[PDB]
Amino acid sequence: MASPFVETAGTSFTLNGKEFYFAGTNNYYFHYKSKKMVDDVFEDMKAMNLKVIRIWGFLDGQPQENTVMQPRPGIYDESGFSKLDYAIYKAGQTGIKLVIPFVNNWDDFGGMNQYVRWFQADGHDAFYTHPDIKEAYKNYVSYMLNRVNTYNGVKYKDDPAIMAWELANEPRVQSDRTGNTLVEWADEMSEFIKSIDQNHLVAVGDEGFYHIEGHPDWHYNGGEGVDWKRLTALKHIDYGTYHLYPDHWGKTAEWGNQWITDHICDGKEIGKPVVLEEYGYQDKSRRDYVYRTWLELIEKQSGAGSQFWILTGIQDDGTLYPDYDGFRIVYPSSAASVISEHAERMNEKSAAS
């Protein structure tokens, strides 16, 4: 049956009775910036033919620009939640879908380490195993899923503007070389979400690292506690996520080509969609060619979609929000045109499905 919620069928997504191949993006500031700044990014997405944006669903502990979502365990604050409500509302108005992780692996916006601090634990990876922290995470998830959006009266778990919930942004368990800890946690937390929300997709939000047995030279494939094939195969996970930052990781753009091909292939073998959920390349003089090449693999090998890091827009004074991290894409630009030409082909593929 046709559904207004994004669903899966084999290695691709579906939406409203048609296949849903997409290009999209990420932005971390929708839960604390003005409506003018948020609206400008949505407007850029429409101009770029983008259909999906991944945004943070967390702001734990310390406020950012006087805005917070969970200042203390179980204390849920309207300053950040009202802004998330607005993003969901605006996505619904504009026909864009959201992907929303519940916690950060990293310390930006508090992260797992804020839970470790609140609960008096002894290090990052306690987040995954301590019952007190797991229950706090569950209480936060359950609050979000059940929250009534103040802009439209629709509970988050009932809103088709949300494509997927995500367990975390880039979860790692460096102290666990087996990958068992994250698989067990992800199994528990995806089951929990599905026990409440029977409308939405769920993904892990991991970076896609493989578990290579022994002691591989490239420590990311085993040493970060991430076993992507096992995570993607979990019963209550609907699609696999993989990220790509070859510069950071000591790799090349051509290694990135092979990384994309390998993850798309593994989606075909597992039988679930896979999304290149974050990607970026730091040399701006080569990124247009690098992105073109990566996105053409996505298109030609039938990957379900991709989301670049990062689309930012204007600030309240009309100037551009700065390129703080070296990954900024603005619209219009030569990199935005590479992406928007690919996005148009993905949207045409969907319409012709």
mmCIF file of C-alpha atoms in Angstrom:
data_model
loop_
_atom_site.group_PDB
_atom_site.id
_atom_site.type_symbol
_atom_site.label_atom_id
_atom_site.label_comp_id
_atom_site.label_asym_id
_atom_site.label_seq_id
_atom_site.Cartn_x
_atom_site.Cartn_y
_atom_site.Cartn_z
ATOM 1 C CA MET A 1 0.000 0.000 0.000
ATOM 2 C CA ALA A 2 1.148 3.565 -0.782
ATOM 3 C CA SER A 3 2.258 5.388 2.374
ATOM 4 C CA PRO A 4 3.155 9.020 3.136
ATOM 5 C CA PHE A 5 5.943 7.669 5.383
ATOM 6 C CA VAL A 6 9.237 6.716 3.777
ATOM 7 C CA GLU A 7 9.459 2.913 3.706
ATOM 8 C CA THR A 8 11.879 0.374 2.272
ATOM 9 C CA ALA A 9 11.547 -2.203 -0.561
ATOM 10 C CA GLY A 10 14.757 -4.232 -1.021
ATOM 11 C CA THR A 11 17.710 -1.857 -1.594
ATOM 12 C CA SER A 12 15.686 1.289 -2.148
ATOM 13 C CA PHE A 13 13.311 3.515 -0.251
ATOM 14 C CA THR A 14 9.700 4.108 -1.253
ATOM 15 C CA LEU A 15 7.439 7.112 -0.694
ATOM 16 C CA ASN A 16 3.811 7.551 -1.746
ATOM 17 C CA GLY A 17 3.867 4.408 -3.874
ATOM 18 C CA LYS A 18 7.022 5.243 -5.848
ATOM 19 C CA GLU A 19 10.725 4.535 -5.355
ATOM 20 C CA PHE A 20 12.516 7.296 -3.423
ATOM 21 C CA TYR A 21 16.098 7.807 -4.586
ATOM 22 C CA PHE A 22 17.434 11.070 -3.244
ATOM 23 C CA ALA A 23 20.256 13.455 -2.640
ATOM 24 C CA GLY A 24 20.271 15.337 0.617
ATOM 25 C CA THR A 25 22.422 17.023 3.216
ATOM 26 C CA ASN A 26 23.134 17.651 6.903
ATOM 27 C CA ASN A 27 22.891 20.718 9.124
ATOM 28 C CA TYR A 28 23.518 20.902 12.890
ATOM 29 C CA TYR A 29 22.042 24.331 13.726
ATOM 30 C CA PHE A 30 18.316 23.921 13.093
ATOM 31 C CA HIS A 31 17.619 23.382 16.795
ATOM 32 C CA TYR A 32 19.143 26.685 17.962
ATOM 33 C CA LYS A 33 19.127 29.223 15.109
ATOM 34 C CA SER A 34 16.367 31.577 13.935
ATOM 35 C CA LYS A 35 13.521 30.727 11.606
ATOM 36 C CA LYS A 36 15.148 33.051 9.054
ATOM 37 C CA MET A 37 18.373 30.964 9.097
ATOM 38 C CA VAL A 38 16.514 27.630 9.038
ATOM 39 C CA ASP A 39 14.155 28.746 6.264
ATOM 40 C CA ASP A 40 17.115 29.858 4.161
ATOM 41 C CA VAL A 41 18.622 26.315 4.280
ATOM 42 C CA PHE A 42 15.249 24.811 3.298
ATOM 43 C CA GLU A 43 15.084 27.266 0.398
ATOM 44 C CA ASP A 44 18.592 26.253 -0.686
ATOM 45 C CA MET A 45 17.465 22.603 -0.600
ATOM 46 C CA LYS A 46 14.582 23.302 -2.941
ATOM 47 C CA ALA A 47 16.854 25.164 -5.351
ATOM 48 C CA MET A 48 19.301 22.209 -5.216
ATOM 49 C CA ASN A 49 16.585 19.527 -5.676
ATOM 50 C CA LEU A 50 17.469 18.005 -2.299
ATOM 51 C CA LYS A 51 14.813 15.897 -0.580
ATOM 52 C CA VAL A 52 16.302 14.866 2.786
ATOM 53 C CA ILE A 53 18.196 16.655 5.537
ATOM 54 C CA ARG A 54 19.832 15.099 8.586
ATOM 55 C CA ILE A 55 19.623 17.339 11.667
ATOM 56 C CA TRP A 56 20.508 16.861 15.325
ATOM 57 C CA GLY A 57 17.747 15.808 17.716
ATOM 58 C CA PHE A 58 19.833 16.500 20.811
ATOM 59 C CA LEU A 59 21.184 19.401 22.845
ATOM 60 C CA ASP A 60 22.258 17.821 26.144
ATOM 61 C CA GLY A 61 23.641 19.662 29.156
ATOM 62 C CA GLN A 62 25.044 23.109 28.391
ATOM 63 C CA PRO A 63 22.877 25.504 26.352
ATOM 64 C CA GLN A 64 24.018 26.834 22.975
ATOM 65 C CA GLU A 65 22.859 30.396 22.311
ATOM 66 C CA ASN A 66 20.508 30.196 25.246
ATOM 67 C CA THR A 67 18.866 27.060 23.780
ATOM 68 C CA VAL A 68 18.835 23.548 25.232
ATOM 69 C CA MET A 69 16.794 20.339 24.912
ATOM 70 C CA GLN A 70 17.853 18.238 27.917
ATOM 71 C CA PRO A 71 19.707 20.381 30.479
ATOM 72 C CA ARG A 72 19.502 17.606 33.112
ATOM 73 C CA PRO A 73 18.347 13.963 32.850
ATOM 74 C CA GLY A 74 14.616 13.838 32.179
ATOM 75 C CA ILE A 75 14.226 17.637 32.084
ATOM 76 C CA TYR A 76 13.001 18.482 28.582
ATOM 77 C CA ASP A 77 13.243 22.177 27.663
ATOM 78 C CA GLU A 78 10.970 24.074 25.267
ATOM 79 C CA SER A 79 13.744 26.366 24.012
ATOM 80 C CA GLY A 80 15.393 23.626 21.855
ATOM 81 C CA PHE A 81 12.294 21.438 21.444
ATOM 82 C CA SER A 82 10.277 24.336 19.987
ATOM 83 C CA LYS A 83 12.955 24.817 17.340
ATOM 84 C CA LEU A 84 12.967 21.114 16.503
ATOM 85 C CA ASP A 85 9.152 21.324 16.280
ATOM 86 C CA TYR A 86 9.549 24.200 13.799
ATOM 87 C CA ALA A 87 12.016 22.212 11.652
ATOM 88 C CA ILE A 88 9.598 19.289 11.490
ATOM 89 C CA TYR A 89 6.720 21.626 10.649
ATOM 90 C CA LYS A 90 8.706 23.436 7.930
ATOM 91 C CA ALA A 91 9.880 20.113 6.437
ATOM 92 C CA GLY A 92 6.229 19.091 6.200
ATOM 93 C CA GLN A 93 5.271 22.377 4.536
ATOM 94 C CA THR A 94 8.041 22.076 1.926
ATOM 95 C CA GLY A 95 7.925 18.343 1.107
ATOM 96 C CA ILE A 96 11.341 17.589 2.601
ATOM 97 C CA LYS A 97 12.123 14.664 4.905
ATOM 98 C CA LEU A 98 14.220 14.688 8.083
ATOM 99 C CA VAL A 99 16.642 12.157 9.537
ATOM 100 C CA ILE A 100 17.087 12.748 13.274
ATOM 101 C CA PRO A 101 19.677 11.084 15.575
ATOM 102 C CA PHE A 102 18.915 11.030 19.316
ATOM 103 C CA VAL A 103 22.447 11.524 20.749
ATOM 104 C CA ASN A 104 25.938 12.509 19.589
ATOM 105 C CA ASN A 105 28.915 10.176 19.858
ATOM 106 C CA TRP A 106 30.951 13.406 20.080
ATOM 107 C CA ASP A 107 30.918 16.121 22.683
ATOM 108 C CA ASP A 108 29.266 18.791 20.487
ATOM 109 C CA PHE A 109 25.841 19.460 21.969
ATOM 110 C CA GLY A 110 26.728 17.352 25.007
ATOM 111 C CA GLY A 111 26.830 13.810 23.547
ATOM 112 C CA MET A 112 27.219 10.467 25.216
ATOM 113 C CA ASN A 113 29.846 12.047 27.470
ATOM 114 C CA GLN A 114 27.195 14.362 28.955
ATOM 115 C CA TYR A 115 25.273 11.211 29.993
ATOM 116 C CA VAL A 116 28.513 9.761 31.407
ATOM 117 C CA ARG A 117 28.977 12.972 33.421
ATOM 118 C CA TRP A 118 25.368 13.100 34.663
ATOM 119 C CA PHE A 119 25.500 9.439 35.771
ATOM 120 C CA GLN A 120 28.959 9.544 37.368
ATOM 121 C CA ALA A 121 30.463 6.931 35.021
ATOM 122 C CA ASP A 122 34.135 6.518 34.281
ATOM 123 C CA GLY A 123 34.410 6.926 30.501
ATOM 124 C CA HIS A 124 32.647 7.425 27.169
ATOM 125 C CA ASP A 125 31.844 3.800 26.453
ATOM 126 C CA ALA A 126 29.912 3.365 29.707
ATOM 127 C CA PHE A 127 27.079 5.041 27.791
ATOM 128 C CA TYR A 128 26.352 1.749 25.996
ATOM 129 C CA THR A 129 26.413 -0.650 28.947
ATOM 130 C CA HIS A 130 25.390 1.073 32.165
ATOM 131 C CA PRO A 131 21.702 0.429 32.889
ATOM 132 C CA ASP A 132 21.156 3.949 34.364
ATOM 133 C CA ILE A 133 22.444 5.592 31.183
ATOM 134 C CA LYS A 134 20.549 3.238 28.885
ATOM 135 C CA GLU A 135 17.326 4.029 30.753
ATOM 136 C CA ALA A 136 17.982 7.780 30.537
ATOM 137 C CA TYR A 137 18.516 7.423 26.770
ATOM 138 C CA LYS A 138 15.277 5.405 26.518
ATOM 139 C CA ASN A 139 13.373 8.027 28.508
ATOM 140 C CA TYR A 140 14.642 10.740 26.168
ATOM 141 C CA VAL A 141 13.739 8.718 23.070
ATOM 142 C CA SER A 142 10.281 7.938 24.401
ATOM 143 C CA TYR A 143 9.685 11.601 25.270
ATOM 144 C CA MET A 144 10.664 12.668 21.760
ATOM 145 C CA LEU A 145 8.621 10.030 19.970
ATOM 146 C CA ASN A 146 5.542 10.997 22.011
ATOM 147 C CA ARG A 147 6.017 14.759 21.936
ATOM 148 C CA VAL A 148 3.199 16.814 20.445
ATOM 149 C CA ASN A 149 4.677 19.244 17.925
ATOM 150 C CA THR A 150 3.617 22.724 19.091
ATOM 151 C CA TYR A 151 3.340 23.914 15.471
ATOM 152 C CA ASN A 152 0.769 21.358 14.295
ATOM 153 C CA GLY A 153 -0.557 19.158 17.106
ATOM 154 C CA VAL A 154 0.962 15.984 15.562
ATOM 155 C CA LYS A 155 3.134 13.718 17.717
ATOM 156 C CA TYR A 156 6.620 13.185 16.301
ATOM 157 C CA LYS A 157 5.982 9.412 15.916
ATOM 158 C CA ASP A 158 2.990 10.260 13.681
ATOM 159 C CA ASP A 159 4.582 12.896 11.434
ATOM 160 C CA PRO A 160 5.515 11.750 7.870
ATOM 161 C CA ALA A 161 7.908 14.699 7.464
ATOM 162 C CA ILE A 162 10.364 12.578 9.476
ATOM 163 C CA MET A 163 11.990 9.905 7.276
ATOM 164 C CA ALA A 164 13.954 8.138 9.996
ATOM 165 C CA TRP A 165 15.084 8.121 13.583
ATOM 166 C CA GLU A 166 18.764 7.384 14.165
ATOM 167 C CA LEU A 167 20.204 5.823 17.276
ATOM 168 C CA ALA A 168 23.235 8.150 17.387
ATOM 169 C CA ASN A 169 25.531 10.354 15.309
ATOM 170 C CA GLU A 170 28.667 8.284 14.558
ATOM 171 C CA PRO A 171 28.540 5.917 17.581
ATOM 172 C CA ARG A 172 31.906 4.326 18.322
ATOM 173 C CA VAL A 173 33.017 1.908 21.064
ATOM 174 C CA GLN A 174 36.791 2.120 20.855
ATOM 175 C CA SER A 175 37.214 0.040 23.958
ATOM 176 C CA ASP A 176 35.421 -2.921 22.287
ATOM 177 C CA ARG A 177 37.350 -4.514 19.425
ATOM 178 C CA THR A 178 34.715 -7.231 18.941
ATOM 179 C CA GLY A 179 31.908 -4.848 17.846
ATOM 180 C CA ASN A 180 29.579 -6.734 20.207
ATOM 181 C CA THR A 181 28.821 -3.826 22.537
ATOM 182 C CA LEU A 182 27.462 -1.555 19.829
ATOM 183 C CA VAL A 183 25.533 -4.366 18.142
ATOM 184 C CA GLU A 184 23.856 -5.319 21.425
ATOM 185 C CA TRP A 185 23.044 -1.695 22.264
ATOM 186 C CA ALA A 186 21.736 -1.017 18.770
ATOM 187 C CA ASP A 187 19.576 -4.145 18.874
ATOM 188 C CA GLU A 188 18.051 -3.058 22.182
ATOM 189 C CA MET A 189 17.473 0.578 21.189
ATOM 190 C CA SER A 190 16.083 -0.093 17.721
ATOM 191 C CA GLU A 191 13.685 -2.625 19.209
ATOM 192 C CA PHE A 192 12.668 -0.017 21.819
ATOM 193 C CA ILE A 193 11.951 2.657 19.182
ATOM 194 C CA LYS A 194 9.935 0.217 17.065
ATOM 195 C CA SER A 195 7.902 -0.811 20.130
ATOM 196 C CA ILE A 196 6.616 2.807 20.275
ATOM 197 C CA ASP A 197 6.730 4.080 16.676
ATOM 198 C CA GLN A 198 5.363 1.733 14.021
ATOM 199 C CA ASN A 199 5.414 4.395 11.287
ATOM 200 C CA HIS A 200 9.081 5.388 10.899
ATOM 201 C CA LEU A 201 12.329 3.886 9.709
ATOM 202 C CA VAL A 202 15.248 3.463 12.118
ATOM 203 C CA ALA A 203 18.967 3.502 11.289
ATOM 204 C CA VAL A 204 22.072 3.306 13.476
ATOM 205 C CA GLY A 205 23.953 6.378 12.241
ATOM 206 C CA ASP A 206 27.346 4.701 12.341
ATOM 207 C CA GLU A 207 30.163 5.539 9.921
ATOM 208 C CA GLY A 208 30.150 2.182 8.098
ATOM 209 C CA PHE A 209 33.425 0.656 9.341
ATOM 210 C CA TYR A 210 33.863 -3.055 8.807
ATOM 211 C CA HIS A 211 34.958 -5.624 11.372
ATOM 212 C CA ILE A 212 38.098 -7.081 9.833
ATOM 213 C CA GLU A 213 39.360 -9.910 12.009
ATOM 214 C CA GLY A 214 42.886 -9.933 13.376
ATOM 215 C CA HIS A 215 44.751 -6.632 13.492
ATOM 216 C CA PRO A 216 44.229 -4.636 10.284
ATOM 217 C CA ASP A 217 46.668 -1.816 9.601
ATOM 218 C CA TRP A 218 43.774 0.675 9.122
ATOM 219 C CA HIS A 219 42.452 0.748 12.669
ATOM 220 C CA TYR A 220 39.042 2.170 11.663
ATOM 221 C CA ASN A 221 38.023 -1.327 10.389
ATOM 222 C CA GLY A 222 37.620 -3.077 13.704
ATOM 223 C CA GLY A 223 39.272 -0.703 16.170
ATOM 224 C CA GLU A 224 36.362 1.710 16.544
ATOM 225 C CA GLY A 225 33.936 -0.911 17.851
ATOM 226 C CA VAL A 226 31.779 -0.610 14.720
ATOM 227 C CA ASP A 227 30.780 -3.778 12.774
ATOM 228 C CA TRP A 228 28.636 -2.261 10.038
ATOM 229 C CA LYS A 229 27.550 -5.503 8.383
ATOM 230 C CA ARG A 230 26.181 -6.827 11.705
ATOM 231 C CA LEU A 231 24.590 -3.470 12.633
ATOM 232 C CA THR A 232 22.858 -3.182 9.247
ATOM 233 C CA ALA A 233 21.587 -6.757 9.487
ATOM 234 C CA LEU A 234 19.777 -6.120 12.826
ATOM 235 C CA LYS A 235 16.067 -6.921 12.610
ATOM 236 C CA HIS A 236 14.814 -3.468 13.625
ATOM 237 C CA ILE A 237 17.303 -1.511 11.521
ATOM 238 C CA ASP A 238 15.807 -0.582 8.155
ATOM 239 C CA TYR A 239 18.832 0.748 6.246
ATOM 240 C CA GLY A 240 22.588 0.983 6.601
ATOM 241 C CA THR A 241 24.473 4.221 7.079
ATOM 242 C CA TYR A 242 28.039 4.950 6.015
ATOM 243 C CA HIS A 243 30.076 8.190 6.191
ATOM 244 C CA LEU A 244 33.112 9.199 4.158
ATOM 245 C CA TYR A 245 35.949 11.571 5.109
ATOM 246 C CA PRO A 246 38.966 10.080 3.343
ATOM 247 C CA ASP A 247 41.275 12.968 4.169
ATOM 248 C CA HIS A 248 40.703 12.646 7.944
ATOM 249 C CA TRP A 249 41.037 8.916 7.792
ATOM 250 C CA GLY A 250 44.409 8.927 5.998
ATOM 251 C CA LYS A 251 42.841 7.672 2.710
ATOM 252 C CA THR A 252 42.375 9.095 -0.797
ATOM 253 C CA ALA A 253 39.387 10.036 -2.981
ATOM 254 C CA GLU A 254 39.952 6.848 -4.983
ATOM 255 C CA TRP A 255 39.811 4.780 -1.815
ATOM 256 C CA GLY A 256 36.512 6.626 -1.237
ATOM 257 C CA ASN A 257 35.245 5.375 -4.622
ATOM 258 C CA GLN A 258 35.929 1.796 -3.492
ATOM 259 C CA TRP A 259 34.336 2.480 -0.061
ATOM 260 C CA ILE A 260 31.112 3.619 -1.751
ATOM 261 C CA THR A 261 31.105 0.669 -4.147
ATOM 262 C CA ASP A 262 31.709 -1.772 -1.261
ATOM 263 C CA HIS A 263 28.862 -0.378 0.867
ATOM 264 C CA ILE A 264 26.391 -0.292 -2.040
ATOM 265 C CA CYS A 265 27.377 -3.893 -2.906
ATOM 266 C CA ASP A 266 26.911 -4.971 0.695
ATOM 267 C CA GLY A 267 23.449 -3.378 0.679
ATOM 268 C CA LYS A 268 22.624 -5.544 -2.369
ATOM 269 C CA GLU A 269 23.863 -8.666 -0.559
ATOM 270 C CA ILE A 270 22.124 -7.890 2.771
ATOM 271 C CA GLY A 271 18.986 -6.729 0.911
ATOM 272 C CA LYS A 272 18.524 -3.303 2.551
ATOM 273 C CA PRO A 273 19.084 0.245 1.333
ATOM 274 C CA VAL A 274 22.302 2.034 2.214
ATOM 275 C CA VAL A 275 22.867 5.764 2.464
ATOM 276 C CA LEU A 276 26.182 7.677 2.236
ATOM 277 C CA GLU A 277 24.753 9.860 5.096
ATOM 278 C CA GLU A 278 27.798 12.157 5.447
ATOM 279 C CA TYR A 279 30.546 12.828 2.932
ATOM 280 C CA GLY A 280 33.101 15.578 2.526
ATOM 281 C CA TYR A 281 36.432 16.314 0.876
ATOM 282 C CA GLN A 282 38.664 19.107 2.128
ATOM 283 C CA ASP A 283 40.610 20.230 -0.996
ATOM 284 C CA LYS A 284 38.119 22.655 -2.523
ATOM 285 C CA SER A 285 40.086 22.773 -5.794
ATOM 286 C CA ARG A 286 39.369 19.045 -6.295
ATOM 287 C CA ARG A 287 36.107 18.516 -4.432
ATOM 288 C CA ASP A 288 33.845 19.205 -7.440
ATOM 289 C CA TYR A 289 35.467 16.351 -9.394
ATOM 290 C CA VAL A 290 35.630 14.106 -6.324
ATOM 291 C CA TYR A 291 31.959 14.654 -5.450
ATOM 292 C CA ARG A 292 30.907 14.241 -9.070
ATOM 293 C CA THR A 293 32.689 10.881 -9.188
ATOM 294 C CA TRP A 294 31.285 9.690 -5.848
ATOM 295 C CA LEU A 295 27.737 10.710 -6.757
ATOM 296 C CA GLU A 296 27.945 9.043 -10.163
ATOM 297 C CA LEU A 297 28.783 5.773 -8.394
ATOM 298 C CA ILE A 298 25.700 6.279 -6.206
ATOM 299 C CA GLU A 299 23.583 6.863 -9.310
ATOM 300 C CA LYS A 300 25.014 4.127 -11.584
ATOM 301 C CA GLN A 301 25.248 1.410 -8.900
ATOM 302 C CA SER A 302 21.744 2.118 -7.564
ATOM 303 C CA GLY A 303 22.640 3.299 -4.085
ATOM 304 C CA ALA A 304 19.562 4.522 -2.281
ATOM 305 C CA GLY A 305 20.891 8.012 -1.533
ATOM 306 C CA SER A 306 23.547 10.275 -0.085
ATOM 307 C CA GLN A 307 23.752 13.388 2.100
ATOM 308 C CA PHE A 308 26.691 15.809 1.951
ATOM 309 C CA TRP A 309 28.254 17.540 4.937
ATOM 310 C CA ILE A 310 27.423 20.480 5.136
ATOM 311 C CA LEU A 311 24.837 22.875 3.678
ATOM 312 C CA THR A 312 24.793 26.221 5.473
ATOM 313 C CA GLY A 313 22.968 29.422 4.509
ATOM 314 C CA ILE A 314 22.759 33.049 5.552
ATOM 315 C CA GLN A 315 22.955 34.433 9.046
ATOM 316 C CA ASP A 316 20.433 36.859 10.488
ATOM 317 C CA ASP A 317 22.374 39.800 9.067
ATOM 318 C CA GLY A 318 22.238 38.316 5.552
ATOM 319 C CA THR A 319 25.915 37.392 5.261
ATOM 320 C CA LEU A 320 26.960 33.758 4.832
ATOM 321 C CA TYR A 321 27.340 31.586 7.875
ATOM 322 C CA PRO A 322 31.147 31.000 7.984
ATOM 323 C CA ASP A 323 33.010 27.945 6.742
ATOM 324 C CA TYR A 324 34.160 26.965 10.247
ATOM 325 C CA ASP A 325 35.103 23.366 9.427
ATOM 326 C CA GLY A 326 36.283 23.489 5.773
ATOM 327 C CA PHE A 327 33.291 21.517 4.456
ATOM 328 C CA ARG A 328 30.811 24.348 3.827
ATOM 329 C CA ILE A 329 28.708 24.130 0.692
ATOM 330 C CA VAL A 330 26.697 27.263 -0.170
ATOM 331 C CA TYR A 331 24.035 27.775 -2.790
ATOM 332 C CA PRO A 332 24.765 28.870 -5.509
ATOM 333 C CA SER A 333 28.260 27.446 -6.019
ATOM 334 C CA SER A 334 30.150 25.102 -8.298
ATOM 335 C CA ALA A 335 29.987 22.275 -5.699
ATOM 336 C CA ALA A 336 26.281 22.896 -5.194
ATOM 337 C CA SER A 337 25.763 22.528 -8.947
ATOM 338 C CA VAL A 338 27.534 19.161 -8.997
ATOM 339 C CA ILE A 339 25.254 17.985 -6.230
ATOM 340 C CA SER A 340 22.049 19.489 -7.643
ATOM 341 C CA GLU A 341 22.612 17.937 -11.092
ATOM 342 C CA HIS A 342 22.962 14.558 -9.433
ATOM 343 C CA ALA A 343 19.903 15.256 -7.228
ATOM 344 C CA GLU A 344 17.815 15.977 -10.302
ATOM 345 C CA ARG A 345 18.769 12.593 -11.811
ATOM 346 C CA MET A 346 17.848 10.813 -8.563
ATOM 347 C CA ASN A 347 14.487 12.595 -8.491
ATOM 348 C CA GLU A 348 13.841 11.694 -12.146
ATOM 349 C CA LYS A 349 14.668 8.056 -11.371
ATOM 350 C CA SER A 350 12.123 8.162 -8.552
ATOM 351 C CA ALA A 351 9.412 9.753 -10.707
ATOM 352 C CA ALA A 352 9.985 7.168 -13.495
ATOM 353 C CA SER A 353 9.846 4.249 -11.059
#
